[PDB]
């Protein structure tokens, strides 16, 4: 049993809810919240900008020190950093950004990072301002992630379309 409430069950291991991931993290304090990161961990907008704002910019300060030490992530890669006031840990995962011309086949690699964590609160990778089709992102999630993932979908219209169209 866990703390997640009001989710629709899609499969054995994937759950979905119309929710603001920031507000969901604040309520649940999950072990792991996933950030929709870029390779530079520049948390300007989208999910990343919202998570970082909720940490009062402490996520960005920590991220800048990580990049200064380790250099950029890979597209499809991830790193584990603090969850600050939102979670124990934040898993920063870089999905391909279609609006930068990145290979959508890297979306599966991105989701494979989730398998290193037993339970996660996450957004749909490469959705929103990363430009991928969210229906596709949900299909890759279900077909890649084997651990227990709680997907918070910010937009109600998109949530309803994702549920209605789910095979």
Ligand X SMILES: O=C(O)c1ncccc1O
Q: Quick one: which segment of 45-53, 69-77, 91-99, 107-115 binds ligand X (CB under 6 A)?
A: 45-53
CA gap 30, 125 in Å, rounded: 18
CA gap 167, 73 in Å, rounded: 33
Q: Of the candidates 8, 20, 67, 80, which one interacts with ligand X according to CB under 6 A? A: 20
120 vs 152, which CB is nearer to ligand X?
A: 152
If we measure between CA atoms, which residue out of 74, 2, 52, 36 comes closest to residue 153? 36
CA gap 67, 40 in Å, rounded: 7
75 vs 127, which CB is nearer to ligand X?
A: 127
Q: Which of residues 48-107 bind ligand X (CB under 6 A)?
A: 50
Binding mask of the shown chain, residues 133 to 152, with x at each position contacting ligand X by CB under 6 A? -------------------x
Tokens of 18: 């119309």
Q: Of the candidates 47, 75, 94, 149, which one interacts with ligand X according to CB under 6 A? A: 47
CB 80 within 8 A of CB 89: yes
Q: Which residues bind ligand X (CB under 6 A)?
A: 20-21, 46-47, 50, 123, 127-128, 152-154
């Amino acid at each position: 049993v866990n703390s997640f409430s009001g989710y629709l069950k899609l499969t054995d291991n994937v759950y979905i809810k119309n929710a603001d991931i920031v507000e969901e993290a604040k309520k649940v304090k999950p072990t792991v919240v996933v950030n929709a990161a870029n390779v530079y961990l520049k948390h300007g907008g989208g999910v990343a900008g919202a998570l970082n704002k909720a940490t009062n910019n402490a996520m960005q300060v920590e991220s800048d020190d990580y990049i200064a030490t380790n250099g950029p992530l890979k597209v499809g890669g991830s790193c584990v950093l603090s969850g600050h006031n939102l979670a124990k840990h934040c898993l920063h995962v870089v999905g391909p950004n279609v609006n930068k011309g990145e290979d959508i086949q890297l979306l599966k690699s991105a989701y494979e990072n989730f398998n290193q964590h037993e339970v996660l609160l996450a957004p749909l990778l490469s959705a929103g301002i990363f430009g991928a089709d969210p229906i596709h992102s949900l299909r890759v999630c279900v077909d890649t992630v084997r651990t227990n993932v709680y997907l918070a979908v910010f937009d109600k219209n998109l949530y309803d379309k994702l549920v209605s169209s789910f095979l």
